[PDB]
Amino acid sequence: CPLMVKILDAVKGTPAGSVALKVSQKTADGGWTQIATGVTDATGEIHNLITEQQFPAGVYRVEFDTKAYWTNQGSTPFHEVAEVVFDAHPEGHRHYTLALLLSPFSYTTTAVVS
Amino acid sequence: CPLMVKILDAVKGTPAGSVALKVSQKTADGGWTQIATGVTDATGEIHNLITEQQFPAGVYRVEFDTKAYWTNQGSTPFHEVAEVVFDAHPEGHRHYTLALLLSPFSYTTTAVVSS
């Protein structure tokens, strides 16, 4: 699994379950095109989010639907979305874990690359 | 000024000076219209980034060129860019401060919103 996520809820002290996300690829032209979607399970993770064949070198954007998550928790969020934009396999294939720490008016995006 | 930023560098323990950013406004069709650009000063701020009149209610996107910042600092960063997207309702002298804390492989974005 070349692309993994781990989302934590800083209000409740649990993983953030049922967070919807979208994975897009940047075109040669210059825009975005959506290639996969997923929803986190109760551990804040998504297994088999994409295949290694869907994940060639290039720039990708992962859009986390934090607004819906907080709304479904009964809280008022600030951000309309949380976007993580990165160049993948710039100099050699490897595995990516996007860690995301959520609060209604704040998030922290970190990356663990192996 | 209804929209301020504060950017800090978590490696050096200073504000992040000379960071370029773009402010865009979501249009009715769902695209984006650029409405301002700026570069942080040595305190990590941009004074008078936009006027009250340029900042009506709606969705905005603030795009911070952190890649260039880290490259110039001599570190190889993870993120191509940092984007903060939010719905503004700037009724009643309601001000937004976007705080951003930068690390080469991490950032934290928070907002402070007045009343």
Next chain:
Amino acid sequence: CPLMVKILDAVKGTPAGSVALKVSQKTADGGWTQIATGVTDATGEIHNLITEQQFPAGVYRVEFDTKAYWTNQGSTPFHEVAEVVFDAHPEGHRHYTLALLLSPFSYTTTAVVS
């Protein structure tokens, strides 16, 4: 004002008012001596917490009562306290700002040094 703080609330998107904190100075024998206490105003700051004369070089500890901050809002927090421990002026006098970003189960502590 060599020692300043800026505390923010990541749940509601405001500065964290009425946060009590204590400043202690490490002693030769390894112990801690309290030198100042204070409470953040509504901007999340404390003015005139200590003087330059009270702030010689050495190890300090700033203890933030985050538990009461969350308890008094009716939320349930994780940490008993937030403690920021640092060596001050190890290469000369400076000015120190401790920024603190608070959520019930998380905080981020950063320093701005001049």
Next chain:
Amino acid sequence: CPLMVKILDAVKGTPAGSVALKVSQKTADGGWTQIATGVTDATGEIHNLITEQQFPAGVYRVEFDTKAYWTNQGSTPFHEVAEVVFDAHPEGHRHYTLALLLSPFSYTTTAVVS
């Protein structure tokens, strides 16, 4: 194990390997008693840091030697140490995971409880 840690390096984008830490239990007299030491493996973790027998309800301190970590990485750090203090099993017994995101001048401490 009832107490796990996960330490990430936000400069390199990897787990923080070989971080030393100490676990202490607050005593009735307001002091601290050390109950364990440990050192993270290359995944930023410590397997079996303590046992259930060592973990009655009460306040605990986990002290992470982050200064030595950054010194070895060849960076100049701000904090002397990173300290996490929390009340364990306040409303009954729980399992705890402490997440720590490290930068030379910043850290984020988060908790995942049960």
